[PDB]
């Protein structure tokens, strides 16, 4: 067979998840450019372009990014839940954590599934937030770390000269420290963000604790159905 229809349509009656411009990192983190991929139903496979346009709006790196995309090949459903509701941060301030690197109708904005916490009254009290997974299916969480440009900003946004981020679950212990350096300016912002991820098994808890440079998760990802799928690279469009 040397001939093909030239279109890109569904397999076995279930429509694939066609990522137009944003990619796995952009969609999972909730890039403000593509808000049409929230609450996405079941799919057959994931289609993304070879060179995504809106990928990791704010500069930085996705830790174990290729590890996560391997898991997405075997997952056929994702659901959003309120793991840590907003407006519950009465001490730290969550709304003002917005950057000019992410435009949205001309406003500076941020990712949907993560929240950037900054100081409110020149104080950054330590937070001890823990979530216990009562859901039967496996649960996915993801957070991030903010690396400031210089020490002047560190005191400007978090008020703590030395900060740490500790994440602890049953099979993961982790101390994270901000790595201040002088970097180049990509997307207009010198600071960088290193996002992390982990898989939370049912009846297991993940404990967060930090006093600065923390990016608390906002929505968590359920894993409803596990099947077979592939993340193909193509510029084709839906063909019905």
């Amino acid at each position: 067979e040397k001939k093909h229809n030239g279109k890109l349509c569904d397999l076995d009656g279930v429509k694939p998840l066609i990522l137009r411009d944003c990619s796995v990192a952009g969609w999972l983190l909730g890039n403000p450019m593509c808000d049409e991929f929230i609450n996405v139903p079941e799919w057959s496979y994931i289609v993304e372009k070879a060179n995504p346009v809106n990928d990791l709006c704010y500069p930085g790196d996705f830790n174990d990014y290729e590890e996560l995309k391997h898991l997405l090949s075997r997952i056929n459903h994702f659901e959003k839940i309120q793991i840590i509701p907003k407006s519950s941060w009465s001490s730290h301030e969550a709304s003002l954590g917005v950057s000019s690197a992410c435009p949205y109708q001309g406003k500076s904005s941020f990712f949907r599934n993560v929240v950037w916490l900054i100081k409110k009254n020149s104080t950054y009290p330590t937070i001890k937030r823990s979530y216990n997974n009562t859901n039967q299916e496996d649960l996915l969480v993801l957070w991030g770390i903010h690396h400031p440009n210089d020490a002047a900003e560190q005191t400007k946004l978090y008020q703590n000269p030395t900060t740490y981020i500790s994440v602890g679950t049953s099979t993961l212990n982790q101390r994270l420290v901000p790595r201040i350096a002088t970097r180049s300016k990509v997307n207009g912002q010198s600071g960088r963000m290193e996002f992390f991820w982990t898989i939370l098994k049912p009846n297991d808890a993940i404990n967060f604790e930090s006093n600065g440079n923390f990016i608390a998760p906002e929505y968590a990802y359920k894993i409803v159905k596990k099947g077979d799928s592939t993340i193909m690279k193509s510029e084709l469009e839906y063909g019905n």
Partner: antibody
Amino acid sequence: EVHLQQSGPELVKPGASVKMSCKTSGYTFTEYTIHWMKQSHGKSLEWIGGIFPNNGDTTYNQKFKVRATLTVGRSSSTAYMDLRSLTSEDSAVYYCVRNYGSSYGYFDVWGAGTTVTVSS
Amino acid sequence: DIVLTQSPGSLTVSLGQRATISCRASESVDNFGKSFMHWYQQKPGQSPKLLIYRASNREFGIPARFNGSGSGTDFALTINPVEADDVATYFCQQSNEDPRTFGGGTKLEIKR
């Protein structure tokens, strides 16, 4: 949000022609086909037809193939239907919906619903 | 041309008791390994909204009280529990081949 609007209520003498409208926003108009339906005072639902905005491919039900016409304007991201030989039988409400799949999928979101009536 | 017959025509259950709604098809609506029948709910004075797609999977935003199961020609939808904010008309739709057809509707009455 992928909320879809429609036009307002319509009045016309029987035997004339009408042109309804549907406005799409919050999502890519090319990917998802737009379908239409008719509801006669809530007794039941029939599928009228669907149109693919990507290339203007149109499919119709045999009950309305004679007079139903579907057209999309990509510039304005809107879908319209044309009715011919209106009759008191056609006094009902219509819904502008988008099918998620491809001839096997489901209709995800429904419009507000534009009702029509004919009377002298 | 699948014609959908839905029984009972009018269902009446008070608050808290399981409410089972069912409809049958002429031939099988199962193809490619998955049965293609979708469940719709239309509240009074409102446009219908999707409840269950492909007869098993439930849409996000729909409370987990709605359960749909079925195989072959018969499919059922169960709601546990039932409160006052559940009165509507429910339809089951097939999509095996065009044209698409709907059920006859079912009013869900409440005893009190």
